[PDB]
Design a binder for this molecule. Sequence first.
Ligand SMILES: CCCCCCCCCCCCC/C=C/[C@H](O)[C@H](N)CO
Ligand SMILES: CCCCCCCCCCCCC/C=C/[C@H](O)[C@H](N)CO
Lengths: 97, 246, 246, 246, 48, 297, 297, 49
Amino acid sequence: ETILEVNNVPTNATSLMERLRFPVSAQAGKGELCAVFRADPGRSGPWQSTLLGQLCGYYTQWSGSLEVTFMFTGSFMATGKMLIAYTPPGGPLPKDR
Amino acid sequence: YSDRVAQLTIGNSTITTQEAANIIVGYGEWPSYCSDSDATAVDKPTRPDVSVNRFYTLDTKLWEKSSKGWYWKFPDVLTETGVFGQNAQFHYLYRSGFCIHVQCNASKFHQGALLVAVLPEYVIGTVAGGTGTEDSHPPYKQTQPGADGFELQHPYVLDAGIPISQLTVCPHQWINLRTNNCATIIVPYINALPFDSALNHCNFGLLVVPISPLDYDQGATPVIPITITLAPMCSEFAGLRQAVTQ
Amino acid sequence: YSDRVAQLTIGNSTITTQEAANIIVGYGEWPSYCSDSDATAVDKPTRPDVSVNRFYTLDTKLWEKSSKGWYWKFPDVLTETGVFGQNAQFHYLYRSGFCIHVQCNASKFHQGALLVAVLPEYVIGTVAGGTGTEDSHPPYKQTQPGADGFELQHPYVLDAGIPISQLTVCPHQWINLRTNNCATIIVPYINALPFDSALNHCNFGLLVVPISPLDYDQGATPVIPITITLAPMCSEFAGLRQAVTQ
Amino acid sequence: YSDRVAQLTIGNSTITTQEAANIIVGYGEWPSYCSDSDATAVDKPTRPDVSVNRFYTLDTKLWEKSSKGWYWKFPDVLTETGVFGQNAQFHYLYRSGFCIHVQCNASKFHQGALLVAVLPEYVIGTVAGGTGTEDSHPPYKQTQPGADGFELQHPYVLDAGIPISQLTVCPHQWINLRTNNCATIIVPYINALPFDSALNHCNFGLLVVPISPLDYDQGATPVIPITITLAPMCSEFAGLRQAVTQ
Amino acid sequence: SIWYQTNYVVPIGAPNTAYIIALAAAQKNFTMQLCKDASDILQTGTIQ
Amino acid sequence: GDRVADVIESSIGDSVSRALTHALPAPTGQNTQVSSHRLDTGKVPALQAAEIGASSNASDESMIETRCVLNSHSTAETTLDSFFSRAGLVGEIDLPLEGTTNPNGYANWDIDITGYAQMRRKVELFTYMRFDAEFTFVACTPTGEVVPQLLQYMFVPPGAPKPDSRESLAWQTATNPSVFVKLSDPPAQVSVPFMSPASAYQWFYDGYPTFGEHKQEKDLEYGACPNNMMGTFSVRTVGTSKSKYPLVVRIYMRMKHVRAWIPRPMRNQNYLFKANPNYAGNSIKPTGASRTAITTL
Amino acid sequence: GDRVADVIESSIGDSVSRALTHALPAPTGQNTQVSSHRLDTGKVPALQAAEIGASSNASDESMIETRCVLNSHSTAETTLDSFFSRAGLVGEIDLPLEGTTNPNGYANWDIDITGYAQMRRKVELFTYMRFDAEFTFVACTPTGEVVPQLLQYMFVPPGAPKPDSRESLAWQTATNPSVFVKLSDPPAQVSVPFMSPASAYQWFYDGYPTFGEHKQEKDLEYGACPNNMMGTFSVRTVGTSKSKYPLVVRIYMRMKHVRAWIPRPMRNQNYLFKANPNYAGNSIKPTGASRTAITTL
Amino acid sequence: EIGASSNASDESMIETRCVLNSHSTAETTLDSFFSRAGLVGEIDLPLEG
Ligand SMILES: CCCCCCCCCCCCC/C=C/[C@H](O)[C@H](N)CO
Ligand SMILES: CCCCCCCCCCCCC/C=C/[C@H](O)[C@H](N)CO
């Protein structure tokens, strides 16, 4: 496993280390969207930070299941439940949860 | 091995939890398909399995410091949702049990306790004109609220003359904020018939209601949501026709 | 026992016929479910069986004395029809064969012969600006007509440079008014993949086209309709998601 | 038995911990003495055992809310410390693996995650004059910082063109403040040679770098220190001479 | 996609905002089949 | 291979309901074994989590040093048969000489067990019930006097012709059951089988009986399951000239061979209507009595 | 019983494709048995119904008195391998000194078998084909002259960096196959495996490759299956200064280990575009020659 | 935090079918990944420069 750069912000080449993590906060609502990205490993660009992504870059064809592990780095006092959905090919970005 | 850490995988859905109570098996009886001796319809039913037998997230209420509690009527909650509801519309007969996973989490400095309960044949009554001299009946939006659910008129009386003071008879599970953060109820198909309409009749009702009020100091989180999740088990449909709704 | 009298019962559907030709088994190969050695997706597919595996009556064209012939593209014909199309929308992967029962009957004083044919991967071309100097492409309503189907631009050329003069290669069956009054074609899942989108890709195309023109004297019936009926066999769906269409 | 409670006793040193992750064995391979078939030097090496094989506390950085992360180069960290470094100076050849125990603890109302990593042959590059048109090289104090270690110029690039985005390849262990309070890495002697200079060559580099920033409210503790501890395992020295340094 | 099932809930003295780290790899039924060049070449224009 | 494995193993169509618990015999109340003191770490019966949804498993032997008790208290009185084999009032039919009510010595009563709270609440404890019945018919005058009259009770199952007259043609009773009693005779008594199309009667139908749109018109049919609507009940004079006496008929129901299924909380509010759980909204009462303070008796 | 019967018997998940017909060996053409006269009622081979959809089963032995013929004519010439193992023209790459076409000694050719009717129509007889390939590259000047030049052919699979210059950095070929030939040397020849993600190449994709709406814009992508789009083909000069000679490269494809599947009618109209079955609408031609009358030759 | 990759298999995250995977892993070996001739040097011998 290697870091999946889901946060993409080149601004300003100094805050580059922010690219390695999600912002998650106390939403004062219901089921707000947190983040979203493509599952395509060889495609640009979040998978391009992973070792799998670059090694995939040396191969035109791949096959098999993939695993994306999410680690929460809040305080121990912080709790929360979140849904994480994989939508197979076809269908657009899920407008709501 | 532990009792509070659980995982529920059905179809392509998966629910994890680390702060739970043990799973309740309804009436000490696991959901099952209909035998050839209980059934009466001669049609060969469809048992779509994975496509319809999976978790559905249908609502999320905000537990405020002064809330009366809500309810949902099954299986009217899914009738417009997913490929389960599609089968429930094109067909006349339906049969399934559910795996309800009510969930609500807060800090360790929050307090309060919910009461998750599955009350079969939850018939709803009306305030009889305030005085008792009016045989009024509830609208469709009250007996079959569906997705968003309905807020109780009065919680003490369960809007039916029956007391919530003894609701823990039928399969229940508390969500006490200082111990658990989710409840899980597995019910079988509870009916006197092997199959039913699924549109007209509602097998049971989920009653999510707080008894000990939510409370918290001037902390950094006042928005505490309760989320309802359910999953049909051993689903059967028979009597195929055109698509019919409410 | 007889050859021309047949009955086709699938699910809760039933087709009878007394004046038919023998049933064609496509490529001498009965439709089957996908093995665990051909498949590649790890998902446990839904095999809804009866609910989706049944006859569908989707269109009825009027065979006039001067008609060029029509076609339909499978399985785009059912995508909005029944509980089959529902599964085909909520899912990414689909697999099925069909049982097409084209039907058209007249008197004994009528004459004419239809040509029912199942042409796999029936890609459609355009008249290149009449002169040949335009790389135009067919609209969505021509490549995926769906329910009502599409009338041929030119029937000789099959709107693809290929000749109808040799269409009887792929599984076919004539409807000659003086002998039979219906055709029946059973095809298996014909594809290089174990599963496909069912919305984007069309496994084959049904080509109903007259070669010997319909003719009749000044009798008491000039309205002779051709009716298309089909039934999915061994249907499988995988890759569940939200409802998606054309 | 438990997974997070651990104790590490080597020689006359002992480290206790109650909130840890499991121990990482480097490349799934326990440190070992050099065989008579891998070795090439004919000298009979000294294996001082207890005196040098023990925990050393060499540095303690202050993890501020905006820090780029630090690194150390092994085994240049001990060269002036203890009776290990004495053997490493009087000798030409050296061989050992290490038991690194990075440690950092805060409250339950703190948050943040460190990334402990052991990157073999961690060669350091320079900003090429800002523009790229200067073949400058790092000073001795940057490639061989020793005791106090060195702060990264840029953390994204690992000061070598390589990305930290995929540093978790080589043996690593996270220090996430809400779960663990210490990391432990056991590496064997990682080199293409059975022995090396220990002064000139550095087998690997310890990279302690935060990815999720330290954060805390206006509590009663803003000084959160990271402390580095290491212990040579199976230490061997050969080629005795006079005392030589950097 | 990532949704909030309920909420990110915090007591009085802890941060209202936290961060999540995503790690990615392949399962064990994973294979690769055809060798291409790297999608991006890292050189402009001559080395040394 | 052949066939596919995910069909071979698949538990689709599993018929028998997997039992998490079996029933044990309990003729007597549970006996009490002797207990002694216990001062240990780890063994802790008293501590429990109500969140789970289960009742306290803590036995009295582990909460207090107990003696031996050979309990032989019978549990027979607390069975569904011996709890429901009690004849209760379920109907009162009036046949006055002249009034607002039925004045022609023919009354029709669509059979509704409810409408009498005591028999109702006892029955409303369960949601589904299946039983045979024993009906008793007590006839007299509004003063309780016994008079020489001849009644005819007739059971009119759903779809059968309802009497529209005191001398209707339906009183020929060529098929549907009817009883001919004098008021001089003791109360007529009849045994009745379980005749619902369903496996059990329902005291609660959480739904509508019809399809289509449910506007404010057809909203009163909510909660109407025809499976426990067993038809109408009719009384005659008998004809042909009008009676000479005011009459009252009281119907009593006794249940036997009872089998209730799923339990229900017990009504704490005044019943107001038949087959309808409505209640007075401004007059909401507590389930029991109340006191002045929680620290006083 | 347990479990339900309609699951036990149910043929859901039947894996093997039920074969209606098996293949028999035919090394030689079918021999002919002797025949005699036959004057019978009921046995009638000649009469058949084409409506059925089957070909005439009537054998020549039952239509005419036949002799014995030991047929030993081989059927080997008529096999997919011996029919497709014929190298045909599939590409012509031009590298002129100065023209409208590629003028820098670097051409890119997205690999498309079609664009040359003879090799196309032969291949278009089947819908699905699976095969290994043998590519040959013939290089010369537009006059056919052989000159002392050094080319570099490079195979650029889908996703690999395409050359944008005669001296592009992609010509390092650290992974993707490339060949270095002189024009002095005989034609370069390479064997190529079947590398589609599908079980076979498709000459016909009756659909769209993308989802969403298919307006008149993305309508040209109809019939585009990326499974038989195997990337691009690139040629070098080689650098760094521009060449001295005009060059032409012709690509020839030979198929081996061929396995076609479902048969297709055979093109009778002029091909007009690559990967697109369009045709001239006003110039629709008959599939063959025509005569003046059906009663004359 | 442990430092290990996810041991969670797809069979325990979703109801899965049977798949007899025969995809070869030969293409992904050090020999078949490095047996590719690449440019490593360019030597120039101009007439005058
Ligand atoms: C000779 C006359 C015999 C009459 C036989 C009547 C037997 C009827 C059995 C009782 C059926 C259940 C009673 C109905 C239930 C409740 O009253 C309401 N329907 C509640 O919705
Ligand atoms: C060293 C260079 C070797 C080049 C290798 C190329 C091999 C490609 C195999 C042929 C693939 C099928 C050809 C494509 C089909 C048709 O041209 C169109 N796609 C029709 O839509």
